[PDB]
Amino acid sequence: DFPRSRLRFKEKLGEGQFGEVHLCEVDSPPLLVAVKILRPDATKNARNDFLKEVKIMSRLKDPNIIRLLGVCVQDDPLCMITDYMENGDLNQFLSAHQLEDKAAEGAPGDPTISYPMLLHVAAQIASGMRYLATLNFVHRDLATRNCLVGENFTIKIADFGMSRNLYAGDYYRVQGRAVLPIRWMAWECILMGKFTTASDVWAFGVTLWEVLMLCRAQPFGQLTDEQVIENAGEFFRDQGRQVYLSRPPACPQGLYELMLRCWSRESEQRPPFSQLHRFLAEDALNT
Ligand SMILES: Nc1ccc(C#Cc2cccc(C(=O)Nc3cccc(C(F)(F)F)c3)c2)cn1
Numbered sequence: 001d002f003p004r005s006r007l008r009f010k011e012k013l014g015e016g017q018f019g020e021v022h023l024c025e026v027d028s029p030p031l032l033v034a035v036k037i038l039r040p041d042a043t044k045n046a047r048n049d050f051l052k053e054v055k056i057m058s059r060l061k062d063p064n065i066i067r068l069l070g071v072c073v074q075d076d077p078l079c080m081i082t083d084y085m086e087n088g089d090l091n092q093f094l095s096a097h098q099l100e101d102k103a104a105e106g107a108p109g110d111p112t113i114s115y116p117m118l119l120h121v122a123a124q125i126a127s128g129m130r131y132l133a134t135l136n137f138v139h140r141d142l143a144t145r146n147c148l149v150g151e152n153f154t155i156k157i158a159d160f161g162m163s164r165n166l167y168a169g170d171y172y173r174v175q176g177r178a179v180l181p182i183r184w185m186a187w188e189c190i191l192m193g194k195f196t197t198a199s200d201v202w203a204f205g206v207t208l209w210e211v212l213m214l215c216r217a218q219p220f221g222q223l224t225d226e227q228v229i230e231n232a233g234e235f236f237r238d239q240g241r242q243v244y245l246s247r248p249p250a251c252p253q254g255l256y257e258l259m260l261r262c263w264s265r266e267s268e269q270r271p272p273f274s275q276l277h278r279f280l281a282e283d284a285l286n287t
Contacts, residue, residue, distance in 0.1 A: 002070040002081060007035060013088075015039075017161030018049040023084060033069060036080040050078055059135060064128030066148065066158040085156060087149035090121075094144065094215040099250050113214070115250060116285070117153060122211050123280040124155040129204055130273035132157075133197050140195045142203040143184050144210045145170065169218070172225050182228050183219040187235030187242075187265070190228075198267035204276065205262025212248035212255075219245055235265055255284055 008025040010032075015021070019036040026033055038050060057068040057080070072079035087093050100112040125147060132139060141159060145167050148156045162171050162179045172182045182190055186202035189195055206219050220228050234242040244263055247256040258279055264270050271279075 001073040002079075004072045004076040004079060007033075007079075009035070014160070015164055017159070017163070018042075018046050018053060019080075024081075032084045034082050034084045036082070038078055047078065050080075054080055059137065060132075062128055062131040063154075064124045064156055065131060066156045083150070083156075085148035085150045087151075089145065090147035090149050090155065091144040091210070091215045093149045094121075094211065097214060099214065118211055118214075118250060119280050119284050121153060121155055122208050123277055125157060125207060125211075126204065126273050126277040126280055128155075128157040129200060130277055133200075133273050136197070138195050138197060139200055139203075141181055141184070142200055142207050143170070143181065144207055144215055147207075172229075182225060185232075186263075186267075187232035188267070190232035191236060196267065198270050201262050201270040201273065201276070204273070205259045206245065208259055208262075209245050209248060209251075212251040214250070238265060254286070255279075 006026055006028050008027075010023045010025060013021045013023050013034060016036050019038050019042075021034050021036045024033050024035045025031065038046060042050075054068070054071055057066070060067065066082055069081045069083065071081065094113075097111055097113040099118075100106065100114050103114060106112055125142075129139070129142070139157070139159065141162065142157070146157065146159050148158050150156070162181070170181055170183065172180045178193065180190070180193075181203075184203045184206045186199040189199045189202075209219065220231075223231075231242055244260065247253070251259075258271065258276070261269070261271050262276075
């Protein structure tokens with residue numbers, strides 16, 4: 001347990017599910033960490049959710065998953081301490097880049113990104129998801145808005161919840177029901193509301209689509225929420241009328257066919273993360 005008195009709060013980094021995240025400095029053995037604390041309006045229910053989030057995160061020990069560095073001492077107000085990811089949100093990060101025209105033509109720091117770097121980003125996500133699958137842990141909300149970027153394009157999977165204003169349009173809300181990220185959801189999750197490792201694979205396919213789009217458009221962006229939900233009914237009925245995300249400009253056909261396998265009607269035909277990682281790290285380099 002880490003004494004709260006060793007922390008110096010510096011700036012607000014954003015909201016989390018049941019708290020708010022601040023950049024902090026630590027003097028003891030100028031190190032920067034990210035610290036989540038309870039929101040100023042926190043109730044008994046928020047505190048309970050916060051304590052359970054600490055327990056969930058203590059399960060997670062992988063280079064491409066966020067890690068809990070410590071918690072505050074029992075007498076202190078509740079805090080969670082994690083790595084400060086210098087480049088922040090992956091969706092906002094990729095939105096600030098464009099695909100390079102000629103390979104290895106720019107100066108260091110140019111706002112461009114290469115096709116092999118897009119594969120490196122997606123491979124790291126697949127490796128973190130492979131790890132969660134070995135714990136039989138189901139994420140339930142994989143998307144670029146829930147991934148973080150550190151130095152040298154290192155990627156960690158995280159989970160900031162479904163209540164942030166910046167991504168409100170990514171969730172479907174009906175009074176009295178669970179909030180749903182429908183444009184990332186497998187057809188069986190839309191229809192029956194339960195989540196599995198195989199539906200995490202489907203969401204990974206959408207996340208991979210996002211990366212190759214450089215986060216320039218929402219999945220199914222020209223269709224309404226109601227049409228996205230009806231599309232799940234067309235997967236169920238299986239009469240060849242369902243529709244899929246289109247091939248991104250940066251995406252060659254061979255990689256697109258892997259994305260299409262993530263969206264198979266049958267869960268067992270979707271590729272495991274071990275095979276998705278191997279394609280992105282090796283086969284995708286082929287000409
Ligand atoms: N620049 C920046 C900006 C923000 C941050 C941060 C942060 C932070 C703090 C506390 C908890 C979590 C979190 O992801 N919780 C969480 C809950 C359930 C499941 C999972 C799972 F890992 F499985 F995805 C993760 C993130 C760092 N650096």
